[PDB]
């Protein structure tokens, strides 16, 4: 028939695919490269700029721009290259023929969702589209109608409580801490051990170090005492050139900043306290049922041990009589996409789409009133 | 008016759905009719109706039920009753449809001399007989090189097998004769054993559509036979409502367990197994299910299923029952695990040639892969049970397809069909005191066939109106499409049911609430029962039917985890188990979606073809030869949609007479110009009739009214003569009286 | 963003 | 009716008196009217008789004086021909069909009455010249 496309713009990975299947088939970094060097060989097929997996194949010679910083799209012209590459090259499906579903963080400038709509109608002639909140989609992806979703990707972290399918707008918390800022801190702590990663290529190398070797200490203080007192933690990793670099307490110490943003100088408390302070903004009849489900979403949650650290220290904050249950499916890195895949295939959703008719009638202003 | 002294009417009664009464004083327009009955009774004329008139005795008993100048339930019920009891004629025509009543007793009519007598006869010239359907399809295929179908509709146990048998005997004999009929008839014991289940009304209800293709060469000699099946009721394998059984084969297999060959399967008492247990009714009365299997295995032998394959199939079905016995303990709300050394799984793994510790893993986890990576993740006890039950439904429907192809291998021919004729045995419209997803599927299928039927009839009447040059505008299509749209459109009951499966925390309460929000005052055909919020009512063509919601989200769910199929394909112990699967969206399709697709493959296979319709009705429950009961008959005539077809034809010009026939009847009232006057003389409303080239067409009432005035004219002439002749005889007897 | 932050 | 007519009619009435009391039965009134030139239907006879019940019709006896007003009340060709043409258009009538309709329709007569009236009027084919039969029965 026709099937919606489902896209999650994110930062770092873009992930896209068809509605009503199990996993995205286009997953690639949202990264744009331009050559900076003198080009020597005549007759190369020299190419102006590179997108996605190509830019990380050639990264040694490229500046890498991320077009999305903290869920805001800062550079539009390079964003359009990413979308254009997604539909034509990665999916090989013309956007005129498919509805499209787009994903965003809450509490961010409305001009962003306006212009994101305008491009889809005017440049791609997408027949219809919708913009959905990442948190909401994580619940569809985990099979609940009730829970408080803690979501952190690259860029923005946000909590949204939901109870029987009603969001509670006054309780939404947003925090910029997650994602790249872990890596931009890790590069500083690695400098203490005499390695220096300056370039945007080296940033991607640190981004791989973090994914391989970092983990969260259940008690932070005893594991610093131990790794000070012994080498037994120490693990070593091979750089792209065959050098080998060795990392000790830094590898737990970097994700710990999620729980103490004082390390990087951020103003406000770590995700346990923003999750608890979010539940405290909810009327007292539902707190039991939010404490009973906490759904972790997006890639930053993947650090080993983070679930047990959360569950422990929230059980320290909460009153003792309640069950705190932390829910962290192993697939959670994809949850926002899987939840959009479920949502876009519901029959009830076929009235929700913004159609081109309504955009042409009322202009991009429509998004705010028709969408959440 | 039409109601006069010496009129006759049908009054409704519980003793028999209608009974005849005589109008003892003329009605005038108010609130009592003076009636006389087989003795005094009075019948209120009440808001509103008038009681329906009775057809005059020229018409009563005629072969064709559309030669009746009133067309309504009691008239039809009476004509079938008298033809069946008084003539012992079973077959009858209703319009294009043949009606064929089950006698419960053999009759001489089928012999080859009658087959010969029917050869070359147009249907209408014959007294209706199933050979008239077979012949007029065969010779249409000969005339015009399009395939033909035969369609046999009703409650099972009304003889659909016998109508198939005699049709293919006809084809054999008028062809001349590949011994196809013997091999075909040898198929029924197995295709029942796998195909049939007890139902709350009935034993040996066939739950699947069956299609037979008889292929013909360019000579119109029988080539060979090919069988297809559609609309299989897969959900029965895992779940039954109370007072029902699973498909017969499972109980045949269980009662066989005493036999030594089946020792190794460890088949228990039929109430030992979760899929047999639930109906609460292990033993049918009047059947030895142990003895049935001696027939099944013989039919397997004599269709060329090897001795090896029979023990493969009974291994597979023992597998299904043992799989059903598998039990899951929840270790957390998210996660479940099979008890250590759980014996049902041990036996299934031994029967089926797989490692215990691979199935123990794959029953309790499911796996997802991005292009780069894979994650294996646990699933809830509810998802583990839904997976196990989908695995059993997938094994069973693949076994069933394998057995059908291994029958076509026994019936196919090297010479390929230049054309074929097709015979479709299908269940009719179904209603019980409870209604459930199976009844919803069956009734939706019948609404699709009844659409096809109404379209074909409208085709034929458009042809007949051009032949007689009466313009089509005076007839109209009666359209059931809104009822199909309510069910299968986007935002239809099946669409909202498939939505509510994938939706999180989907439940039959939130489903019902979505129905009511969507339809409850948006659509004429959908209604809510006044006292309940868990049920809904669909006005089908035949009847209103109230469905309970309480089952559907159990039954509609199907998904199979390809990991478990890949465990089964890996099996080394015997050939059949990997052979079943060999031939990725379909794993995710719900039962309602698979059903609707199979129903399209059928509706294209019949739109490919030109149909002919037979209806079968079962006139009593106790199998009493040549006994008829109005209270079963009225049900089954309704479950076959005959009574709508009659109502629609009564909205047409149902009675049509040639000029000779009319003139020969009604000269007493008084060639084409002659009748063209006589109708204007006798009828004031020109709408009541149309002229044609060879025929006159009447609106329903008219022919009985003309018979009425004819009888009155004849009465007056008779009485005038009677009085004058008797008076002259009295004047003669006066002279006798002197003498 | 536009004020309180770089994006 | 004039005095002569009344006298002739009374004499005829007395001829129908089978008991000697100067009376007939209700069931004979029609017979007397028909013998006197009237052609009443059985319904007309019962109406002028007052729709008598079976018992008085079969056993109650009435004298001439009560009959006379009834005779008066009853008293106060092309149709006959068309009526016979009903059962035809070659001017003939089957003997079987006329017999069946006269013994089974209308005011049904006995088979002996029909045989008596039809005797000699049907030919070898079993056809009756109905114009001649009509003249015969009207004489
Ligand atoms: N038209 C018929 N003529 C003769 N016998 C009939 C007829 N219809 C039914 N019977 C008998 O009545 C019984 C029921 O018919 P049968 O063909 O066995 O139905 P069936 O096997 O249940 N077909 P199905 O209902 O599709 O499974 C059998 O004993 C038949 O011999
Ligand atoms: N296994 C892992 N462990 C720790 N961090 C990870 C892991 N995988 C990805 N990340 C980090 O998570 C971020 C990507 O998260 P993701 O959810 O893909 O972003 P988005 O929400 O934009 O999709 C990157 O910073 C990446 O380095
Ligand atoms: Mg994300
Ligand atoms: Mg059968
Ligand atoms: Mg049978």
Distance B466 CA to ligand 2 centre (A): 74
Dihedral sign (CA A181, A184, A189, A193): positive
Q: Exposed, middle or buried by CB within 10 Å (0-12, 13-18, 19+), for A167?
A: middle
| C-alpha to C-alpha distance for B192 and B190, rounded to whole angstroms | 5
Of all protein residues, whose CA lies closest to atom 12 belonging to ligand 2? A299
Distance B237 CA to ligand 5 centre (A): 23
Closest ligand (CA of B103): 1
Q: What is the DSSP track for B497-522?
A: HHHHHHSTT--HHHHHHHHHHHHTTT
Active site residue B428: yes
B496/A140 CB distance under 8 A? no
B205-206 and B196-197 strand pairing: antiparallel
Q: What is the DSSP track for B648-694?
A: HHHTS--EEEEHHHHHHHHGGG--HHHHHHHHHHH-S-GGGEEE-SS
Q: Does C3 contact A at CB distance below 8 Å?
A: no
Q: What angle do CA B531, B535, B540 make, to 5 degrees?
A: 110
| C-alpha to C-alpha distance for D51 and A168, rounded to whole angstroms | 94
- SS3 track for A70-119: CCEECCHHHHHHHHHHHHHHHHCCCHHHCCEEEEECCCCCHHHHHHHHHH
| C-alpha to C-alpha distance for B268 and B257, rounded to whole angstroms | 7
Q: Cα torsion at B555, B557, B561, B564 (round to 10°)?
A: 0
What residues pair up with A159 in beta bridges, in sequence order? A150, A173
| C-alpha to C-alpha distance for B160 and B164, rounded to whole angstroms | 6
- Burial call D55-91: b when 16+ CB within 10 Å, e when fewer: eebeeeebebeebeebbeebeeeeebeebbbbbbeee
Residues A296 and A216 sit within 8 Å (Cβ to Cβ): no
Partners of chain B (3+ Cβ pairs below 8 A): A, D
Determine the atom of ligand 1 nearest the C-alpha atom of B206.
27
Q: What angle do CA B536, B539, B543 make, to 5 degrees?
A: 115
Q: What is the DSSP track for B592-624?
A: HHHHHHHHHHHHHHHHTSB--EEEEE---SS--
- Burial call A177-214: b when 16+ CB within 10 Å, e when fewer: bbbbbbbebbbebbeeeebebeeebbbbbbbebbeeeb
Q: Is A302 in the pocket of ligand 2 (CB under 6 A)?
A: yes
Give the ranges where B326-436 is alpha helix by DSSP (H): 343-352, 356-362, 381-411
Active site residue B157: yes
Q: Is B581 in the pocket of ligand 1 (CB under 6 A)?
A: no
B370/A27 CB distance under 8 A? yes
What residues pair up with B224 in beta bridges, in sequence order? B215
Cα separations in angstroms, B676 against A265, B662, B670, B679, B690: 106, 11, 12, 6, 10
A331/B372 CB distance under 8 A? no
Interface residue ranges in chain B relative to chain D, Cβ cutoff 8 Å: 667-668, 713-731, 733-734, 737-738
What residues pair up with B420 in beta bridges, in sequence order? B215
Active site residue B205: yes
Q: Judge if A2-28+70-135+335-368 and A136-182+272-334 fold alike in CATH terms.
A: yes
Q: Cβ–Cβ contacts within 10 Å for residue A38, how many?
A: 5
> Of the residues B200, B202, B419, B571, which is catalytic?
B202
Residues A70 and A155 sit within 8 Å (Cβ to Cβ): yes
Contacts of B505 in chain A (CB under 8 A): 143-145
Q: What is the DSSP track for B109-135?
A: GGSHHHHHHHTT--TTTSPP-HHHHHH
What residues pair up with A102 in beta bridges, in sequence order? A131
Q: Is A333 in the pocket of ligand 2 (CB under 6 A)?
A: yes
| C-alpha to C-alpha distance for D98 and D86, rounded to whole angstroms | 10
Of all protein residues, whose CA lies closest to atom 19 belonging to ligand 1? B159
Contacts of B587 in chain A (CB under 8 A): none
For chain B, the residue count is: 739
Distance D37 CA to ligand 2 centre (A): 124
Q: Which of residues 675-694 of B touch A (CB under 8 A)?
A: none
The superfamily (CATH) of domain A2-28+70-135+335-368 is: ATPase, nucleotide binding domain (3.30.420.40)
Cα separations in angstroms, B43 against A273, A283, B604, D78: 83, 68, 51, 44
Distance A302 CA to ligand 3 centre (A): 12
B513 vs chain A: nearest CA distance in angstroms?
13
Distance A70 CA to ligand 2 centre (A): 14
Which CATH architecture describes the domain A136-182+272-334? 2-Layer Sandwich (3.30)
Residue D39 exposure: Cα atoms within 13 Å on the Cβ side:
13
The CA R_g of chain B, rounded to the nearest whole Å, is 31
Domain ranges (residues) in chain A: 2-28+70-135+335-368, 29-69, 136-182+272-334, 183-271
Distance B189 CA to ligand 4 centre (A): 9
What residues pair up with A101 in beta bridges, in sequence order? A6, A130
Contacts of A176 in chain C (CB under 8 A): 5
A27/B499 CB distance under 8 A? no
| C-alpha to C-alpha distance for B477 and B296, rounded to whole angstroms | 47
Domain A183-271: which CATH number of 1.20.120.80, 3.90.640.10, 3.40.50.300, 3.20.20.70 = 3.90.640.10
| C-alpha to C-alpha distance for B167 and B160, rounded to whole angstroms | 11
Of all protein residues, whose CA lies closest to atom 10 belonging to ligand 2? A299
Dihedral sign (CA A5, A8, A12, A13): negative
Cα separations in angstroms, B257 against B262, B269, B290: 5, 8, 9
DSSP state, residue A333: G
Active site residue B193: no
Q: Is A70 in the pocket of ligand 2 (CB under 6 A)?
A: no
Determine the atom of ligand 1 nearest the C-alpha atom of B155.
25
Active site residue B102: no
Active site residue B430: yes
Quick one: which H or E segment has residue B10? strand B7-12
Determine the atom of ligand 2 nearest the C-alpha atom of A8.
23
Size of interface B-D (CB pairs under 8 A): 83
| C-alpha to C-alpha distance for B251 and B270, rounded to whole angstroms | 6
The superfamily (CATH) of domain A29-69 is: Actin; Chain A, domain 2 (2.30.36.70)
Of all protein residues, whose CA lies closest to atom 1 belonging to ligand 1? B102
Dihedral sign (CA B194, B196, B199, B202): negative
A112 vs chain C: nearest CA distance in angstroms?
10
> Of the residues B215, B319, B428, B652, which is catalytic?
B428
Cα separations in angstroms, B178 against B191, B210, B251, B415, B497: 22, 22, 35, 11, 48
Q: Is B626 in the pocket of ligand 1 (CB under 6 A)?
A: no
Active site residue B306: no
C2/A176 CB distance under 8 A? no
Q: Cβ–Cβ contacts within 10 Å for residue B228, how many?
A: 16
| C-alpha to C-alpha distance for B670 and B667, rounded to whole angstroms | 5
Contacts of B731 (CB under 8 A, 6+ apart): D34, D35
Contacts of B103 (CB under 8 A, 6+ apart): B88, B90, B625, B626
Q: Is B649 in the pocket of ligand 1 (CB under 6 A)?
A: no
Contacts of A72 in chain C (CB under 8 A): 1, 7
Q: Is B110 in the pocket of ligand 1 (CB under 6 A)?
A: no
Name the phi and psi angles at B94, rounded to 5.
-115, 105
B419-427 and B148-154 strand pairing: parallel
| C-alpha to C-alpha distance for B54 and B43, rounded to whole angstroms | 16
Q: Write down the CATH number for the domain with range B437-556.
A: 1.20.58.530
Q: Is B106 in the pocket of ligand 1 (CB under 6 A)?
A: yes
Q: Is B157 in the pocket of ligand 1 (CB under 6 A)?
A: yes
D22 vs chain B: nearest CA distance in angstroms?
15
- What percent of chain A is helix, strand and coil (3-state, nearest 5)? 45, 20, 40
Residues A118 and A79 sit within 8 Å (Cβ to Cβ): no
Helix axes B672-682, B659-666, angle to 10 degrees: 60
| C-alpha to C-alpha distance for B656 and B67, rounded to whole angstroms | 8
State yes or no: B312 annotated in a binding site: no
Give the ranges where B230-272 is alpha helix by DSSP (H): 248-255
Active site residue B161: yes
Residues A161 and A148 sit within 8 Å (Cβ to Cβ): yes
Breaks (C-N over 2.5 A) in chain C follow: none
Of all protein residues, whose CA lies closest to atom 29 belonging to ligand 1? B104
Q: Is A297 in the pocket of ligand 2 (CB under 6 A)?
A: no
B729/D116 CB distance under 8 A? yes
Domain ranges (residues) in chain D: 2-77, 78-137
- The structure was resolved to a resolution in Å of 3.4
Interface residue ranges in chain A relative to chain C, Cβ cutoff 8 Å: 69-70, 72, 74, 109, 176
Chosen from A143, A299, A345, A353 to mutate, greatest number of chain B CBs within 10 A: A143
Distance A250 CA to ligand 5 centre (A): 80
| C-alpha to C-alpha distance for B297 and B306, rounded to whole angstroms | 10
Breaks (C-N over 2.5 A) in chain B follow: 29, 38, 47, 177, 583, 670
> Of the residues B199, B205, B398, B649, which is catalytic?
B205
Partners of chain D (3+ Cβ pairs below 8 A): B
């Amino acid at each position: 028939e026709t099937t919606a496309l489902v896209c999650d713009n994110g930062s770092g990975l873009v992930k896209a695919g068809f509605a009503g299947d199990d996993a995205p088939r286009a997953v690639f970094p949202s990264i744009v490269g331009r050559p900076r060097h003198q080009g020597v060989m005549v007759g190369m097929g020299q190419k102006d700029s590179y997108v996605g997996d190509e830019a990380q194949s050639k990264r040694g010679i490229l500046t890498l721009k991320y077009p999305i910083e903290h869920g805001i799209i800062t550079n539009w012209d390079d964003m359009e290259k990413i979308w254009h590459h997604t539909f034509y090259n990665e999916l090989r499906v013309a956007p005129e023929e498919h509805p499209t579903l787009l994903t965003e963080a809450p509490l961010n400038p409305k001009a962003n969702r306006e212009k994101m709509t305008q491009i889809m109608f005017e440049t791609f002639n997408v027949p219809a589209m919708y913009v959905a909140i990442q948190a909401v989609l994580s619940l569809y992806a985990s099979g609940r109608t009730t829970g408080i979703v803690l979501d952190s990707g690259d860029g923005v972290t946000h909590n949204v409580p939901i109870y029987e399918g009603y969001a509670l707008p006054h309780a939404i918390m947003r925090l910029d801490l997650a994602g790249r800022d872990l890596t931009d801190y890790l590069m500083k702590i690695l400098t203490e051990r005499g390695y220096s990663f300056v370039t945007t290529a080296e940033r991607e190398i640190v981004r791989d170090i973090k994914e391989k070797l970092c983990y969260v200490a259940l008690d932070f203080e005893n594991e610093m005492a131990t790794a000070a007192s012994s080498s037994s933690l120490e693990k070593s990793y091979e750089l792209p050139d065959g050098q080998v670099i060795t990392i000790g307490n830094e590898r737990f110490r970097c994700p710990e900043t999620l729980f103490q943003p004082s390390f990087i100088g951020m103003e406000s408390a770590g995700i346990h306290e923003t999750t608890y302070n979010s539940i405290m903004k909810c009327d007292i009849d539902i707190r039991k049922d939010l404490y009973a489900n906490n759904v972790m979403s997006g890639g930053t949650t993947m650090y080993p041990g983070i679930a047990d650290r959360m569950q422990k220290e929230i059980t320290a904050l909460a009153p003792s009589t309640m069950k705190i249950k932390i829910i962290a499916p192993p697939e959670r890195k994809y949850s926002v996409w899987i939840g959009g895949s479920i949502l876009a295939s519901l029959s009830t959703f076929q009235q929700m789409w913004i159609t081109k008719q309504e955009y042409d009638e009322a202009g991009p202003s429509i998004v705010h009133r028709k969408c959440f | 008016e039409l109601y006069t002294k010496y009129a006759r009417v049908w009054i409704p009664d519980p003793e028999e759905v209608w009974k005849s009464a005589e109008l003892l004083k003329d009605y005038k327009p108010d609130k009592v009719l003076q009636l006389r009955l087989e003795k005094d009774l009075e019948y209120c004329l009440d808001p509103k109706e008038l009681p329906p008139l009775r057809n005059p005795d020229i018409l009563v008993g005629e072969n064709d039920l559309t030669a009746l100048s009133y067309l309504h339930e009691p008239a039809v019920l009476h004509n079938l009753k008298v033809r069946f009891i008084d003539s012992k004629l079973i077959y009858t025509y209703c319009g294009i449809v043949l009606v064929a009543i089950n006698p419960y007793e053999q009759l001489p009519i089928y012999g080859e001399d009658i087959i010969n007598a029917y050869s070359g006869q147009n249907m209408g010239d014959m007294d209706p007989h199933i050979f008239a359907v077979a012949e007029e399809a065969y010779k249409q295929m000969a005339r015009d090189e399009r395939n033909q179908s035969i369609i046999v509709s009703g409650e099972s146990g009304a003889g659909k097998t016998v109508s198939a048998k005699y049709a293919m005997r006809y084809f054999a004999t008028v062809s001349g004769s590949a011994n196809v009929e013997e091999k075909v008839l040898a198929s029924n014991p197995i295709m029942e054993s796998i195909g049939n289940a007890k139902t709350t009304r009935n034993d040996n209800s066939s739950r699947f559509g069956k299609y037979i293709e008889i292929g013909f060469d360019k000579r119109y000699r029988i080539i060979g036979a090919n069988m297809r099946t559609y609309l299989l009721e897969k959900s029965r394998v895992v779940f039954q409502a109370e007072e029902e059984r699973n498909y017969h084969i499972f109980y045949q297999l269980c009662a066989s367990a005493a036999l030594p060959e089946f020792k190794t399967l460890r088949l228990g008492n039929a109430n030992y197994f979760h899929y047999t247990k639930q109906g609460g009714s292990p033993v049918i009365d009047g059947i030895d299910d142990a003895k049935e299997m001696v027939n099944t295995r013989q039919a397997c032998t004599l269709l060329g299923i090897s001795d090896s394959y029979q023990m493969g199939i009974f291994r597979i079905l023992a597998g299904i029952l043992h799989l059903g016995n598998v039990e899951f303990a929840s270790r957390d709300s998210d996660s479940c695990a099979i008890p250590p050394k759980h014996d049902p799984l041990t036996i299934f793994c031994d029967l089926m040639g797989v490692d215990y510790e691979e199935m123990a893993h794959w029953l309790c986890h499911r796996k997802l892969a991005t292009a780069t990576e894979t994650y294996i993740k646990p699933i809830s006890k509810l998802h583990a049970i839904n997976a196990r039950d989908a695995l059993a439904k997938h094994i069973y429907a693949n076994l069933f397809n394998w057995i059908v192809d291994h029958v076509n291998k026994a019936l196919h021919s090297t010479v390929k069909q230049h054309s074929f004729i097709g015979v479709l045995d299908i269940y009719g419209f179904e209603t019980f005191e409870i209604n459930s997803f199976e009844q919803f599927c069956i009734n939706y299928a019948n609404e699709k066939l009844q659409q096809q039927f109404n379209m074909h009839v409208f085709k034929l009447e458009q042809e007949e109106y051009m032949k007689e040059q009466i313009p089509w505008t005076l007839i109209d299509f009666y359209d059931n499409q809104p009822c199909i749209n309510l069910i299968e459109a986007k935002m239809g009951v099946l669409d909202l049911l498939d939505e509510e499966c994938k939706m999180p925390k989907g439940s039959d309460d939130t489903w019902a609430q979505k129905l009511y929000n969507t339809h409850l005052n948006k659509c004429a055909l959908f209604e809510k029962p006044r006292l309940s919020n868990k049920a809904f009512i669909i006005k089908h063509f035949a009847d209103k039917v109230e469905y309970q919601c309480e089952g559907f989200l159990e039954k509609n769910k199907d998904t199979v985890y390809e990991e478990q199929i890949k465990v089964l394909k890996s099996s080394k112990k015997f050939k059949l188990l990997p052979e079943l699967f060999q031939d990725s969206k379909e794993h995710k399709k719900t039962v309602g979606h698979q059903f609707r697709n199979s129903l399209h493959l059928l509706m294209e296979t019949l739109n490919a073809t030109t149909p002919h319709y037979v209806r079968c009705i079962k006139p009593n429950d106790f199998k009493f030869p040549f006994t008829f009961d109005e209270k079963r008959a009225v049900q089954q005539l309704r479950a076959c949609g005959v009574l709508e077809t009659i109502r629609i034809s009564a909205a047409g010009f149902p009675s049509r007479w040639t000029y000779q026939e009319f003139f020969s009847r009604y000269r007493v009232l008084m060639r084409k110009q002659t009748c063209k006057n006589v109708l204007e003389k006798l009828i004031l409303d020109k709408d009541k009739y149309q002229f044609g080239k060879t025929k006159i067409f009447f609106r329903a009432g008219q022919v009985a009214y003309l018979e009425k005035i004819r009888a009155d004219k004849l009465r007056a002439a008779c009485i005038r003569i009677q009085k004058t002749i008797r008076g002259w005889l009295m004047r003669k007897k006066y002279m006798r009286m002197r003498r | 963003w536009x004020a309180x932050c770089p994006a | 009716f004039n005095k002569d007519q009344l006298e002739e009619f009374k004499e005829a009435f007395e001829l129908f008196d089978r008991v000697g009391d100067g009376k007939i039965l209700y069931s004979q009134c029609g017979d007397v009217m028909r013998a006197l030139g009237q052609n009443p239907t059985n319904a007309e006879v019962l109406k002028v008789l007052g729709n008598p019940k079976s018992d008085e019709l079969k056993s109650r006896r009435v004298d001439f004086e009560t009959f006379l007003p009834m005779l008066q009340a009853v008293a106060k060709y092309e149709d006959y021909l068309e009526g016979f043409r009903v059962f035809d258009g070659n001017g003939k009538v089957m003997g079987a069909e006329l017999r069946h309709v006269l013994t089974t329709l209308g005011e049904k007569m006995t088979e002996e009455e029909v045989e008596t009236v039809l005797a000699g009027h049907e030919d070898s084919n079993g056809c009756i010249n109905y114009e001649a039969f009509l003249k015969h029965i009207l004489s």
